[PDB]
Amino acid sequence: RSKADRMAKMERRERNRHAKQGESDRHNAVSLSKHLFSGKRGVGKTDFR
Amino acid sequence: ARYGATSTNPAKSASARGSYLRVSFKNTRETAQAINGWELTKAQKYLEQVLDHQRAIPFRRFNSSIGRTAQGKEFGVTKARWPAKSVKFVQGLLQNAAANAEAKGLDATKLYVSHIQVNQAPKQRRRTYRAHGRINKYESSPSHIELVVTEKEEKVVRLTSRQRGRIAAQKRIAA
Amino acid sequence: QNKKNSITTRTLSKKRAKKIERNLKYATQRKLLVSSLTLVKEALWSVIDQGTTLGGPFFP
Amino acid sequence: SEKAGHQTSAESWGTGRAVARIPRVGGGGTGRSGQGAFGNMCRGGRMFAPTK
Amino acid sequence: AKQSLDVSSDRRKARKAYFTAPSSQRRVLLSAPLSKELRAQYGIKALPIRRDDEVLVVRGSKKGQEGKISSVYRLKFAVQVDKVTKEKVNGASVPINLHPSKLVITKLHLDKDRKALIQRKGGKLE
RNA sequence: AUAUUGGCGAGAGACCGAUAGCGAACAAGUACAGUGAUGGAAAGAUGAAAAGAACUUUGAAAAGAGAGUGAAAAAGUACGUGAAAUUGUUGAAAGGGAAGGGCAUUUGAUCAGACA
RNA sequence: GUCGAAUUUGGGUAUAGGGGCGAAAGACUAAUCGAACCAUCUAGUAGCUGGUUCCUGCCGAAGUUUCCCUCAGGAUAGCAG
RNA sequence: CGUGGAGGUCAGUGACGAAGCCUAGACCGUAAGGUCGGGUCGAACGGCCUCUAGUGCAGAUCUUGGUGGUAGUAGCAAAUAUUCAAAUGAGAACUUUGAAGACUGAAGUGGGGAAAGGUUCCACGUCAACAGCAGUUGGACGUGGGUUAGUCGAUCCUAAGA
Ligand SMILES: [Mg+2]
Ligand SMILES: [Mg+2]
Ligand SMILES: [Mg+2]
Ligand SMILES: [Mg+2]
Ligand SMILES: [Mg+2]
Ligand SMILES: [Mg+2]
Ligand SMILES: [Mg+2]
Ligand SMILES: [Mg+2]
Ligand SMILES: [Mg+2]
Ligand SMILES: [Mg+2]
Ligand SMILES: [Mg+2]
Ligand SMILES: [Mg+2]
Ligand SMILES: [Mg+2]
Ligand SMILES: [Mg+2]
Ligand SMILES: [Mg+2]
Ligand SMILES: [Mg+2]
Ligand SMILES: [Mg+2]
Ligand SMILES: [Mg+2]
Ligand SMILES: [Mg+2]
């Protein structure tokens, strides 16, 4: 039991370093966001204030 | 194992280390530099005074836009702080080093900090949500700290024939 | 220096030290040519390797 | 494979977007989104002059 | 050199076959030669090793040791002999995994099926 | 006799070698995104063998220091090798509003050849 | 500003892209509308911009001529081998 | 001059250490480059004659990954507000009880539902990560318990419609 517990603790280390809320936290960020990197702003209506 | 520097004659030295410590790398670097080279008990008392805000840690490298204090004058600086988390981690490692030296049988009154090193651990990567739907990094900078304490303890000349003759003439002239 | 018997960054690994010992024995040969559990278990292995009458014909 | 590097849904984001004009993978929710695509200089893209 | 078109010399295929072979194939893969005396007595060279026969270690650090087969761990392609172990100070004893091609059978565990196997391989027992 | 980028069974290569090669060498059309049609990743290597570090000691603990296993821990489930950017310590040096480079020599450090 | 009605609102239901719906602003039609979103044909099309990876040796140019009416795009002469 | 792979050869190199990598050391080339020593490392690899190509990078707002300076900086200032003792604990501004001070002020910071979610409800254990300070606490982590209908709904009816 203690050996398997130590194995699980050693396994946890990289997800803990990535600051996951647990096993179930698998949120994926996109590399680039088009709404943030698609700007060519004329004289008129913009996409944000 | 595998410190940055070791002690020749390890029978008169003791070492301690702490890895992946979630404490500020920059503050801890300044704390370890404030400790470097001191006698061990003197360093421990100094760190207790620092926690008590009677003395201060000088900040020499990572100190852009820090406030100024009168407790820096003892070290000839104006920028000094009182980093509690760094001081407590370093005090823990100092107590461990003293324990190891006692287990080895070293004389505690003669021990001085002969090596102390702070390295950057792998970062802790949180993220924050910011305006216009952005994700920005929000990271912790942890430290590896290692230290060694040590007991403090206490001609052929080739001449030309001209030079040789000059020396022989000088000796003949002299008594 | 260790065979002859401050702070330094010169250390010798045990892998390299064993290789130096082996290679020195090679050179020396050329120059010439030119457990409590075990004991307890074995001890146990070595060790293992008219009459009388009470009562009588009556019901007590 | 003559389909290598082409089984991807990607389009350029246009000129004046402060990023390079290489076509980029659409959609969202995964690290592949927004990445460069199709090019012989792109990771996972088609090699120049594929062998036949 | 191979002559059949049904046999493959491909390394990748041979290794996949070895590492995914099932238990009945692993029995044949874990064969062991017989000793000189047993070889002369039975007239055969090697047999698939089984659980109750006695072996001699002829290779490795445990060479020269004898014992009875304790188990045939086919999942890890190894056998364990009762007298061939590694010991710790806290009393722990871990069996050594030995490959049967590095062993030698000194006494066979005979039954009806084993006798039939020897006789159909050309053995001449008794 | 002809066709055959689907299915089943085989044999091969002057092919690729984990950013390559199919999107996928791994619980990959997975995880994840989208109301939906659809979009769609990352991710291989301790060791011959888990022998994966008993025991003592410091610490609330993670851990450390001894000890031990192992050929090796300069292999410790962050695990073969372990580059560069960037960083710490130590040693040497330079610095009156940049540094770097060329020719030449002083100084300090350091070094090979040739030694009958 | 309006606040008892051309009022506000849940749910169900109908209308779908060279279409709908519009007390009409080219509004709105899932952060998308001078043309929704998704896949494919498709590596669509270049007058233009950017880039295009080892060494050394020897040789080494070109705005100066005719034309397709002239722009554009081409042909021809010259110069370098 | 250099690189991946192919035919031939040196009965070539290699666990007395192949390849790779680091190097205040040595040498040869005008140069592309080549060669030797030391350290590290652990299983393969070269010279020559030829064959062949997905064969040499500083740039492309190049692609993917990694990392700096900025910097212990900007900042963590809406929603009136906190304080005392004890307990628990390695550790308490933030946990629990009590003692107090305030607030929502019935168009509520109260008591229930519909849509949506799906166990978040509740107990025991318990702190690596998460709760932009903290944490002994938690809607977190680990193991379980819990939703009982002839009368409440669905189910039946028809609506615009399909
Ligand atoms: Mg400021
Ligand atoms: Mg938002
Ligand atoms: Mg590809
Ligand atoms: Mg791939
Ligand atoms: Mg490594
Ligand atoms: Mg570097
Ligand atoms: Mg080598
Ligand atoms: Mg190319
Ligand atoms: Mg580059
Ligand atoms: Mg260039
Ligand atoms: Mg760039
Ligand atoms: Mg980048
Ligand atoms: Mg501030
Ligand atoms: Mg407030
Ligand atoms: Mg009030
Ligand atoms: Mg009020
Ligand atoms: Mg609850
Ligand atoms: Mg926090
Ligand atoms: Mg729970």
Identify the helix (H) or strand (E) that includes residue B138.
strand B134-140
Cα(E56)–Cα(C27) distance, integer angstroms = 37
Discontinuities after residues in chain D (C–N over 2.5 A): none
CB E27 within 8 A of CB E74: yes
Q: In angstroms, what is the resolution?
A: 2.4
Cα(E89)–Cα(E94) distance, integer angstroms = 12
In chain E, the number of structural domains is 1
Q: CA gyration radius for chain E?
A: 17
CATH number of the domain at E45, please: 2.30.30.30
Cα(B12)–Cα(A6) distance, integer angstroms = 35
Cα(A32)–Cα(D27) distance, integer angstroms = 11
The tokens for D34 are 């927004």
D41 Cβ nearer than 7 Å to chain H strand = yes
Q: Of B49, B21, B52, B23, which is closest to residue B35 (Cα–Cα)?
A: B49
- Amino acid identity, residue B13? S
| Inter-residue long-range contacts of C19-28, CB under 8 Å, 24+ positions, other chains counted | none
Q: How many A from CA of B65 to the centre of ligand 1?
A: 7
CA atoms within 13 A on the CB side of B103: 9
Cα(B23)–Cα(B32) distance, integer angstroms = 13
CA B21, B24, B25, B27 dihedral sign is negative
Q: Which nucleotides of F are covered by protein (CB under 7 A)?
A: 5, 10-13, 19-24, 29, 31-34, 38-42, 49-55, 57-59, 61-66, 68, 70-75, 77-78, 87-90
Spanning CA of E33 to C1' of G52, the rounded length in angstroms is 66
Cα(B117)–Cα(E109) distance, integer angstroms = 65
Q: How many A from CA of A42 to the centre of ligand 12?
A: 28
Spanning CA of D14 to C1' of H152, the rounded length in angstroms is 61
Residue B118: which residues within 8 A CB-CB, separation 6 or more? Answer: B25, B28, B29, B32, B143, B144, B145
β-bridge mates for residue C57, sequence order = none
β-bridge mates for residue E57, sequence order = E103
Contacting partners of chain E (3+ CB pairs under 8 A):
C
Nearest to A28 among D15, D31, D35 (CB): D31
Q: Chain centroid to CA B2: how far?
A: 17
End-to-end CA distance of chain E: 39
Cα-flanking dihedrals φ and ψ of residue D10, to 5°?
-145, 150
Spanning CA of E77 to C1' of F48, the rounded length in angstroms is 14
Give C-chain residues touching E89 at CB under 8 angstroms: 35-37
Discontinuities after residues in chain B (C–N over 2.5 A): 154
Cα(C46)–Cα(C38) distance, integer angstroms = 12
Q: How many residues does chain C have?
A: 60
Cα(E72)–Cα(E98) distance, integer angstroms = 10
Position of tokens 């059978």? E105
CB C11 within 8 A of CB B1: no
CA A31-A33-A36 angle, to 5 degrees, is 140
Quickly count: other Cβ atoms within 10 Å of residue E21's Cβ. Answer: 15
Cα(B144)–Cα(B117) distance, integer angstroms = 8
Cα(B122)–Cα(B22) distance, integer angstroms = 10
Give the three-class secondary structure for B59: coil
CA D20-D26-D30 angle, to 5 degrees, is 105
Quickly count: other Cβ atoms within 10 Å of residue E53's Cβ. Answer: 20
Q: Is E87 left (phi over 0), alpha (psi -120 to 50) or beta?
A: beta
End-to-end CA distance of chain A: 58
Range of the domain at E8: 1-126
Helices (H), ranges, chain B: 25-35, 40-51, 84-104, 161-173
